[PDB]
Write a protein that binds this ligand. Sequence first.
Ligand code: HEM
Ligand code: HEM
Ligand SMILES: Cc1cc(CCc2cc(CCN(C)C)cc(F)c2F)nc(N)n1
Ligand SMILES: Cc1cc(CCc2cc(CCN(C)C)cc(F)c2F)nc(N)n1
Ligand SMILES: C[C@H](O)[C@H](O)[C@H]1CNc2nc(N)[nH]c(=O)c2N1
Ligand SMILES: C[C@H](O)[C@H](O)[C@H]1CNc2nc(N)[nH]c(=O)c2N1
Ligand SMILES: [Zn+2]
Lengths: 410, 416
Amino acid sequence: RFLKVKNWETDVVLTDTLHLKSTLETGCTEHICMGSIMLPSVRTKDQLFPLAKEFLDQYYSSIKRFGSKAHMDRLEEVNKEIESTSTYQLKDTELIYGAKHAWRNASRCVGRIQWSKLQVFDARDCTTAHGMFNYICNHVKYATNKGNLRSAITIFPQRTDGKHDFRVWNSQLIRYAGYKQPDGSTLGDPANVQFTEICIQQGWKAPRGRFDVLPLLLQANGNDPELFQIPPELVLEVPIRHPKFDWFKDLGLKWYGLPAVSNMLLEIGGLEFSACPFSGWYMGTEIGVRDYCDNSRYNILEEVAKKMDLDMRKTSSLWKDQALVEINIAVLYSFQSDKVTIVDHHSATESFIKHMENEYRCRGGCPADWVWIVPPMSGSITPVFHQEMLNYRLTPSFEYQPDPWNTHVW
Amino acid sequence: RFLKVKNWETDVVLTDTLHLKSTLETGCTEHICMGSIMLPSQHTRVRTKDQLFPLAKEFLDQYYSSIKRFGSKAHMDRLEEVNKEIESTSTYQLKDTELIYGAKHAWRNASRCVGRIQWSKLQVFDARDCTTAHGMFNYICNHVKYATNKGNLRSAITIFPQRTDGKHDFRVWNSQLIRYAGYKQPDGSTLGDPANVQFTEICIQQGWKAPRGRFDVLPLLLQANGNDPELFQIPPELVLEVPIRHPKFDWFKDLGLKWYGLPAVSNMLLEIGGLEFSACPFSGWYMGTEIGVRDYCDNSRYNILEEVAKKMDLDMRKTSSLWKDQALVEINIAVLYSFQSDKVTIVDHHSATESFIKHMENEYRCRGGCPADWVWIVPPMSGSITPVFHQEMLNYRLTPSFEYQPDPWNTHVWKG
Ligand code: HEM
Ligand code: HEM
Ligand SMILES: Cc1cc(CCc2cc(CCN(C)C)cc(F)c2F)nc(N)n1
Ligand SMILES: Cc1cc(CCc2cc(CCN(C)C)cc(F)c2F)nc(N)n1
Ligand SMILES: C[C@H](O)[C@H](O)[C@H]1CNc2nc(N)[nH]c(=O)c2N1
Ligand SMILES: C[C@H](O)[C@H](O)[C@H]1CNc2nc(N)[nH]c(=O)c2N1
Ligand SMILES: [Zn+2]
């Protein structure tokens, strides 16, 4: 019950004890593994205090003041505040710690070696969509940093009764619109067809291009959401060209520099932050493999192979694989040439292996979701393919939450 | 209680009731997922008459259900006959019909196998009358001949006598019937297949005269009735090999690469109705990535990415040039081209995974589910451009089944 994990390429063996601190549940049982399910299926005053005590217990341990002076004081203080108000407010130091460790604990995240460098922006004093917009613009400008990207999170006021939730209705702060055509096919990003519909169904006048940055749809204190246009000078974009094939720039492709997830929920000490946009920088395959080549997305593999004059009549010519590689060489070359931070899947997975070693050494483990850590191309020539990983849920954490337009009383 | 899985690229949803018929444990709990452990405690494997009859009874209920005779007089008479055989002899014997059903359904239940659409067209060779290593050699030669079929490969399995007290096991000591030797040089480098250095040494110590080349078919090391194992050389005219060339790169033949055509796993344990068949070599035909991605490009195997990238002259200084990815695609194009050119059966990973989705959906329709191990079903290159990447999958353990077992040289009691 002190588990071991082995790397089959190097025979490195790590022992995991961290998992015994795990609290929440995975969805698996002894009779069935759900490890490939995408998304496995307010607080009463009672269950809130054990949540706060457990979080405070680990916070004060991390500063080497467990069972100390201030620890028992803070424990009493939070105890008192809950019985009366049926919630409590985090100190700044605890908010920063809680956010860094939600990332540290994100078992699907390969870029976690950077976890302790996160820049945490407290936006708990915000009251309106306009203020939200202002916090978000400042986040975007800070994180972009003229292409020298910096990790950042901005944390909006916590849930109170579920009627006054702060929510960013976009799934990412920067995404391209998607339009359905009269002739069935889809122009732009197919993932965002419904969201693009809501924005137009809200007032947005769409340019109807293939790369239209979506407006922000911001909801403060449970009110109706409001549209906002992110100033273009804050949306850093990269035109995609290839280091060998000059015809590549003619394809008219680009992508944005800043990946900023905005629809997740951040859980710290039992408190729920339903608007907490966070951003880092891209691994190349996220754009080149998934965004560009998923059949349900931009699905560009047909055009690239054609302009490569590859025999596309048999799958066994591996023309898709061959095209896929070139696209991803192009994304990397484009960002690197424009001095925008990006990491290739070989470097990021190699760093994650080093990060696992560190976590096993200094923390006793590292929860990790193999199905999501292995890149979606060239899996077995990356070190994470040959790495056994234990997956388990730790708190603080990021969780999924319902889309607001299915829930909001409009 | 029902369970659903979703294909996120097509939004197709399927409903699994078959997992209820599952007994054996997975390794996971409510608080930890062992989904990526290579050899979990439960996927690996003597039984007393205590627990044996319930396993027989459950197999026989399955068997007679499948032939629409559940509860029939033939069904009840067989249960009775098996019970009395177990109490008086402590084991039992499967009928030929039950052996065939058992082996097919062990393949059907193999949740890590992407090739299962073919499961009902398996040729089963009954070798339970075999008694000596020489007899095993003769059975395996005939399997290899039948399965190879001059390049028109045919799925086959050969089943040697079942375990009795664990002291009289039949075992094929090789991990596959056909594999290339690997030699450790004094300078630390490896000649041949590094995956086989340990087994190669065992063969040499047993008397094999190794040619010490880069592609030497290993001898068979066969164990009958718990006796010491013996070496046999498969007749070379039965080992179909394919020289590897590339359809555009004429310098690729000069790498001197070749592979064998018949993939034939020989170290698994087959479990049917509580009976353990410790020697049961089985064979199919290759998916190209098994050779092109893993055999040739795993850093711990032949590891040819360097030499291929050199002769392609790629930027090998920075990894962000994706020279490794570029070389890997070419090597896998060359493997598929060489096999198709020589009319030796092979399937590419796009075709195989598409077939498996069709197989899987059909299994949900007519069977109520299909256990599948996503970590193993998704191919080791170009994962997300194959449809299984986007397919939710439920993994659970059904019997009959194939199981791992310890390598015999770690458990064998040597006669001398
Ligand atoms: C700094 C560079 C980063 C890289 C290269 C990176 C990379 C990735 C990748 C490839 C995934 C897989 C999900 C997908 O393919 O869509 C992922 C998941 C995730 N990332 Fe990271 N990420 C980075 C930064 C961050 C930061 C700053 C945070 C939070 C502060 C974060 C939180 C998460 C979470 C919560 C998930 C998974 C959500 C789930 O459970 O499904 N990441 N990341
Ligand atoms: C017909 C062509 C076949 C193909 C293309 C195929 C393909 C595969 C592949 C790619 C794997 C993943 C294992 C690895 O990558 O090393 C696998 C696993 C497996 N295959 Fe198939 N297979 C075929 C036929 C068979 C047959 C005939 C059997 C037995 C009757 C079989 C039984 C299994 C089993 C038990 C596993 C699981 C191995 C484990 O648990 O580690 N396969 N197969
Ligand atoms: C900050 C950051 C995040 C990511 C991963 C993108 C990401 C994507 C999803 C949606 C998954 N799918 C259902 C669409 C959920 C997430 F929490 C998530 F973080 N990458 C990079 N480079 N930086
Ligand atoms: C008949 C057949 C089998 C296979 C899969 C190869 C295979 C590999 C392993 C070892 C797993 N790993 C630790 C190396 C165990 C197996 F049972 C197994 F069947 N493929 C093809 N084409 N045909
Ligand atoms: C079906 C499967 O769970 C789903 O496709 C997952 C698999 N692994 C993934 N891995 C990453 N990094 N991102 C993803 O979106 C997914 N999707
Ligand atoms: C650690 C990890 O579970 C292990 O490397 C697995 C991953 N998936 C695999 N999938 C296949 N088809 N074959 C393998 O050998 C492996 N190895
Ligand atoms: Zn699991």
